[PDB]
């Protein structure tokens, strides 16, 4: 009961095993429920004109991205549009294009039925279906963006009515804000802006169809059908939460605690429920454990460490490990890497010299050391990337040395040249052609001047003293 | 050993007539003088003194008659049976709500 118990695992298990386990009858019943829901939303989608022309347009985009290939002996392959329908796909598309032309020109009933039936021929599971429902939604999304925007632009200026919405809200007009001359919203810039936005609104509608009520109801019916399907799938998934926990008992200490294990399981299950069709007479329990296992092992390989590691490098490690145990508990001896490779699909003899070099999870800095004079590792790591107050005192003794050494050299010139050409208190360390302009002459013998300065500096009068710093 | 292994139809009677000396693990031996060489470092395992397993009666006498009892097990969880000021025989399992001993 709800009795102050804090640890969440119980507060989840309680609700988890509440609703009853079901039988194949119920499973297939809710399956055909979700199937007929999907067919409802599908059928009710493609009963609008622009849908198929936009479909054909996306096919045109694939056509040009296909022509972009011979620039680099088939139709250039790309079928990420439809799943399990390329010559047949392309040809069907050609028929679609031409017949759709005739459709948009002449008829009323017949060829619309023809195109919906040839669509009934097609096969798309959930990706492209959602692609189309967004094909419809996103336009409504953008026009609602523009509506919210014109509101926010005018309503908090135009006398701030906020309640005379019924008078102003008439959209696609650009005939209401002119009386606003004799009303509020002295908003000329805003005037041309809202006229731009309403222009784009009418333009979007022209692209699509008549006024907002031509799409609002479409989206409403879509929401309804989708809510039916959602409730069906929710009832389905809620029936087998226990399968998750049952399978998740093996992986229990490999690096992750239990709750997140369970969550990854539930992800891999929720992803499994919608791609499992009743059309084959089978058991949901059989097929779903595949997805459960995939999710759990993927998450484990993902976040079982601090220093993340790719997944292939991890399954190869597991393979090496199983081989090592097999041989240890068979021949007594331990490694004999000659044997580790002598029968292995690894097909390499150097990766092993690296695949196990990353085999130490980092120790934690706060592990006491038993007796060991009563300390911990977290006070033996020391700063290594800085300059200890001696490492940074043997520098100014040189940073200032040569700053004087040079002051007993040239009158001024070679000093200027060494500063400019090496960079000392400068900003860039200029190049030969820069000093070449500094003195208006001597594009070349500037090098001679620097050579003279250096040959003048390497004299035991000035040299051996500095020789220490190296 | 195995057999047909049907619904107890001579379940495990007939097969698997073999056996072998499976490897188990490693056992650290002690020298003649009572030390162990662990990673080449002579170590010693001092003995340990610990309470005995049985029944122990005491009385934490910031009261009168505040007797108690303990059933100390060699491995597990240890019961008790305490009294009160009035004479109630409570009961707890290693730590718990103080429920009456008649529950058991």
């Amino acid at each position: 009961l709800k009795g102050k118990t804090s640890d969440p695992i119980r507060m989840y298990m309680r609700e988890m095993g509440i609703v009853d386990l079901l039988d194949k009858k119920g499973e297939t019943d809710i399956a055909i429920r979700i199937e007929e829901g999907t067919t409802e939303v599908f059928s009710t989608i493609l009963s609008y004109p622009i849908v198929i022309k936009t479909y054909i347009e996306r096919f045109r985009e694939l056509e040009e991205k296909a022509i972009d290939y011979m620039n680099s002996e088939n139709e250039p392959v790309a079928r990420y549009i439809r799943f399990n329908e390329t010559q047949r796909a392309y040809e069907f598309f050609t028929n679609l294009e031409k017949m759709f032309e005739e459709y948009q020109d002449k008829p009323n009933k017949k060829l619309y039925t023809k195109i919906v039936k040839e669509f009934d021929n097609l096969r798309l599971s959930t990706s492209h279906l959602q692609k189309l429902v967004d094909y419809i939604r996103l336009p409504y999304a953008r026009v609602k963006e523009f509506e919210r925007k014109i509101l926010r632009l005018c309503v908090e200026r135009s006398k701030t009515p906020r309640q005379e919405f019924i008078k102003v809200y008439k959209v696609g007009s650009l005939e209401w804000l002119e009386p606003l001359t004799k009303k509020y919203k002295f908003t000329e810039n805003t005037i041309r802006e809202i006229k731009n936005l309403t222009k784009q609104i009418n333009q979007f509608q022209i692209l699509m169809m008549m006024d907002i009520e031509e799409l609002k109801q479409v989206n409403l019916e879509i929401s309804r059908s989708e809510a039916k399907i959602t409730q069906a799938k929710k009832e389905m998934i809620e029936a087998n939460l226990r399968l998750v926990v049952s399978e998740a008992k093996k992986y229990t200490n490999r690096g992750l605690h239990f709750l997140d294990i369970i969550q990854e399981g539930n992800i891999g299950l929720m992803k499994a429920v919608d791609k499992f069709d009743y059309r084959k007479g089978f058991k949901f329990s059989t097929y779903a454990t595949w997805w459960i296992r995939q999710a759990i092992t993927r998450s484990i390989a993902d976040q079982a460490r601090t220093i993340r590691v790719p997944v292939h490098m991890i399954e190869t490690i597991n393979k090496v490990n199983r081989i090592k145990r097999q041989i240890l508990q068979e021949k007594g001896r331990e490694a004999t890497e000659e044997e580790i490779i002598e029968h292995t699909p690894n097909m390499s003899k150097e990766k092993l010299k690296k695949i196990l070099n990353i085999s130490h999870t980092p120790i934690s800095m706060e592990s006491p050391i038993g007796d060991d004079e009563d300390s911990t590792v977290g006070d033996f790591i020391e700063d290594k990337n800085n300059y200890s107050p001696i490492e940074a005192a043997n520098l100014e003794n040189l940073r200032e040395a040569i700053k004087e050494l040079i002051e007993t050299g040239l009158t001024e010139r070679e000093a200027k040249v060494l500063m400019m050409r090496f960079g000392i208190g400068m900003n860039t360390d200029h190049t030969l052609e820069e000093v070449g302009k500094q003195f208006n002459v001597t594009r070349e013998r500037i090098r001679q001047i620097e050579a003279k300065a250096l040959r003048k500096l390497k004299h035991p009068s000035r040299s051996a003293f500095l020789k220490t710093f190296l | 050993v195995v057999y047909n292994k049907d619904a107890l139809p001579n379940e495990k009677i007939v097969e698997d007539i073999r056996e072998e000396y499976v490897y188990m693990g490693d056992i650290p031996l002690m020298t003649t003088n009572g030390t162990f060489i662990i990673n080449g470092t002579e170590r010693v395992v001092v003995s340990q003194l610990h309470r005995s397993p049985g029944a122990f009666f005491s009385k934490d006498d910031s009261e009168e008659g505040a007797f108690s009892a303990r059933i100390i097990p060699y491995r597990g969880s240890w019961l008790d049976f305490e009294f009160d000021s009035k004479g109630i025989i409570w009961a707890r399992i290693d730590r718990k709500r103080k429920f009456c001993a008649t529950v058991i």
Binding site: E334, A335, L356, N357, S359 | -
Partner: protein, 52 residues
């Protein structure tokens, strides 16, 4: 003497070569060390006086 791992150990992979060095040194008592008879008395050597 050769039934080792050809390098005398499993080497704890990652390690190429290792060497052990053994150094010995006599030490004599000096002002500061700590003596103690068997009867619980103790102290710190404070000086060293010439024989005479």
């Amino acid at each position: 003497k050769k039934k080792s791992i050809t390098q005398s150990n499993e080497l704890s992979p990652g390690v190429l070569k290792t060497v052990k060095v053994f150094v010995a040194i006599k030490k004599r008592i000096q002002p500061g060390d700590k003596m103690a008879g068997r009867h619980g008395n103790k102290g710190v050597v404070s000086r060293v006086l010439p024989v005479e």
